């Protein structure tokens with residue numbers, strides 16, 4: 001990597017560190033001390049999740065490069081113009097600097113007479129303008145590749161599913177909090193704030209939006225089954241993704257019936273609980289048996305792992321396995337809380353804590369999914 | 383060159399940038415109108431000048447390496463473990479971070495039980511301990527070399543004068559504001575300081591200290607004349623450095639008069655003006671003709687410059703000549719003002735704005751001095 005790239009990575013990291021310390025101090029001492037904080041870190045939560053995801057994805061790229069996993073060939077990339085982990089760190093640091101500046105501007109109202117609620121819009125809009133910038137200036141190859149991939153993923157059944165499409169769609173499952181926060185931002189900027197006072201910091205559709213990434217992966221799996229006509233690897237995981245639909249709709253029904261105090265609430269509660277188990281198991285086993293390929297028959301000397309191990313220490317696997325089992329359930333509940341009103345008290349704390357943990361779980365999942373895809377042609381993308 | 387070195391350089395740069403911005407913002411939006419901040423400025427000015435000197439010296443190292451000026455040969459350094467400009471940037475960034483943290487602690491008092499007069503002491507003690515660290519960590523080779531060179535410089539007439547000794551003595555001649563500020567800090571922390579309050583302040587020997595680097599250079603060139611038995615250029619250089627003694631003693635006599643009313647103020651003022659012109663012209667002509675080697679009639683198309691030039695543009699040399707004239711006169715006036723009390727108003731402002739300018743003048747001087755050392759073997763160090 002170029003020396004200036006490493007310098008910019010370090011510069012962005014240092015600015016981000018100092019701005020995080022300043023942000024913590026300003027929040028502790030001089031935020032409002034009485035008004036509220038929740039509407040602020042629910043708009044900024046999605047941006048923070050995106051920055052964290054980019055940083056962890058740079059870590060993933062470094063791990064794949066060191067371990068010998070050919071993620072360039074798996075993602076169908078040219079081995080001469082791809083992004084290193086340095087560039088991912090650089091993008092994450094720059095976006096984190098913008099996020100910290102926007103949040104500090106929200107904290108420090110007397111900066112100007114400009115309303116506070118325009119600061120989030122200046123951030124996310126910039127994140128759009130950076131992404132869809134057609135001037136061929138900043139990471140134009142990678143940005144155009146990502147835009148094409150997003151178009152293919154969101155128009156899911158009408159395109160052949162390569163590894164990149166499935167990977168991005170399955171990672172949108174971990175980033176669904178971003179979509180929920182976008183919906184919340186639309187609702188807040190349509191019906192909540194006053195648009196004339198500094199009320200950015202205050203003194204049904206949601207359930208359907210929660211299942212959008214699961215819907216994309218479900219229709220992708222249906223398309224894969226249609227193309228390949230293999231019932232086992234392409235319909236079992238379709239049911240795995242549909243368990244998310246069932247859990248979300250049962251949680252929504254429970255919340256709606258409990259809002260009116262109906263007698264059917266219980267007859268739904270247990271149902272949701274059952275699916276809360278099934279989904280949590282259905283996604284978990286696929287993570288450990290199909291995504292990662294562990295618990296193989298020909299384990300050999302390695303215990304509970306496969307015959308071939310790419311990463312230097314097998315211990316990295318075992319904790320990861322535990323981590324997955326710990327966080328998969330933590331993911332599942334994090335959905336039901338976010339898409340419904342299951343916990344009118346708390347809930348925001350639970351989602352705000354579990355969403356970074358879900359991104360971390362996806363980050364850990366990437367290592368071994370790519371390791372499996374490299375060693376054995378799992379997913380059958382050739 | 384190592385990637386982590388560049389990362390740390392960038393990290394310290396970013397931290398230093400954000401800390402400077404927060405520092406100026408605090409200075410604008412903190413402090414007390416009644417209480418002055420001049421002792422604080424005069425205490426931290428030396429550290430700021432040292433950090434600026436290290437940054438500009440890293441720039442000098444980069445310029446020498448790019449231009450082919452073999453500074454390792456003339457400095458008599460080890461060609462296998464010499465310091466790079468990245469490491470100088472690293473040291474400058476780390477020391478700047480510490481300097482900014484101590485200045486912020488003086489501004490934003492973090493602990494009410496810790497008085498705001500140990501932070502300057504803590505910063506300078508940390509600098510001293512970093513320099514004289516006996517363990518083989520944190521640039522131990524370079525620090526030991528610098529300590530040995532400083533010992534040789536401050537015991538000048540007893541060691542054979544190599545290039546490094548003379549160069550470091552000239553750097554001290556440009557940095558004598560650091561010695562003046564250290565003397566002022568010693569006097570302040572012994573005579574004028576209310577140790578019973580947590581605030582940093584309340585709402586003859588100096589002239590001798592002013593001539594320490596000039597005396598070191600004078601005895602160095604006298605030693606060189608004694609060793610080589612050549613009147614030119616060593617005795618001429620000795621006279622050049624003694625012009626500083628004459629200027630300082632006449633400024634001191636002028637300041638002693640005009641307050642005790644001895645009616646001999648005008649003659650001392652005239653003598654000080656004469657020796658101000660003499661010292662400025664002497665040093666400027668030595669820089670242009672002897673240090674840099676310019677104005678050589680054995681040149682070609684290079685008007686007013688030498689025959690052979692290693693820096694890419696000839697405009698650099700003309701800009702250097704203009705800035706050298708201006709900053710030589712500025713250095714002379716500020717070295718006269720700092721050593722005395724001839725300006726009841728301003729003076730501190732003029733010294734504070736001229737000391738970094740003298741550091742910058744020495745930074746520009748290093749380029750062409752080492753260009754002439756590398757090309758025509760000036761100084762005759764062989």
Ligand SMILES: CCCCCCCCCCCCCCCCCC(=O)OC[C@H](COP(=O)([O-])OCC[N+](C)(C)C)OC(=O)CCCCCCCCCCCCCCCCC
Pocket residue numbers: 001006009012013016051052055059062089090092093096385386389
């Ligand atoms: C004392 C600090 C403790 C950790 C800091 C606390 C933060 C949390 C933990 C962070 C861990 C960071 C590890 C990254 C992986 C290291 C990669 C590496 O060593 O590469 C070698 C690279 C060089 O690799 P290379 O390209 O030479 O590859 C090696 C090739 N061989 C082996 C052939 C020689 O080193 C570097 O140049 C430095 C990499 C950058 C350091 C990572 C920090 C980036 C920060 C980004 C800004 C923040 C974004 C926002 C974050 C939001 C998060 C919520």
Ligand SMILES: CCCCCCCCCCCCCCCCCC(=O)OC[C@H](COP(=O)([O-])OCC[N+](C)(C)C)OC(=O)CCCCCCCCCCCCCCCCC
Pocket residue numbers: 050057061075076077078081082083084091124127128130131139141142143144145146175178182
């Ligand atoms: C409406 C919102 C929908 C949801 C969007 C959620 C985020 C989607 C993007 C996240 C994934 C980004 C990286 C995935 C690709 C990783 C694969 C890989 O290793 O390759 C490196 C990838 C691709 O590079 P590459 O190395 O594959 O390129 C190889 C070269 N060619 C093209 C020739 C093959 O790197 C990138 O994608 C970097 C480009 C910038 C990425 C981030 C830019 C800012 C993102 C902001 C999102 C929009 C704003 C959101 C806020 C809400 C707005 C309403």
Ligand SMILES: CCCCCCCCCCCCCCCCCC(=O)OC[C@H](COP(=O)([O-])OCC[N+](C)(C)C)OC(=O)CCCCCCCCCCCCCCCCC
Pocket residue numbers: 003004007383388391394395398430433434437441444471472474475478
């Ligand atoms: C935004 C506008 C820019 C200016 C902002 C204000 C700063 C003032 C001007 C700064 C000029 C910086 C020039 C440095 C030389 C460039 C080196 C180079 O080209 O090599 C690339 C180097 C790598 O060099 P390299 O070894 O690859 O050499 C290049 C030659 N090749 C490629 C053939 C081998 O990349 C870097 O890591 C960048 C250098 C560091 C960045 C410089 C800033 C350091 C600041 C230190 C911290 C603070 C110190 C105190 C502040 C001073 C005041 C008190």
Ligand SMILES: CCCCCCCCCCCCCCCCCC(=O)OC[C@H](COP(=O)([O-])OCC[N+](C)(C)C)OC(=O)CCCCCCCCCCCCCCCCC
Pocket residue numbers: 428429432436439443457459460463464465473506509510512513521523524525526527528553557560561564
């Ligand atoms: C009593 C007053 C004293 C005033 C002293 C004023 C400062 C003196 C030091 C400034 C110059 C330092 C660098 C000059 C040499 C550069 C030459 C070169 O290019 O080679 C690289 C040189 C040599 O590196 P090298 O690795 O090539 O070493 C030579 C190789 N061997 C040893 C193997 C032969 O690098 C250095 O000298 C860098 C070492 C660290 C420099 C900074 C350390 C901190 C300084 C703190 C000073 C004290 C604080 C005072 C605070 C105020 C008062 C309280």
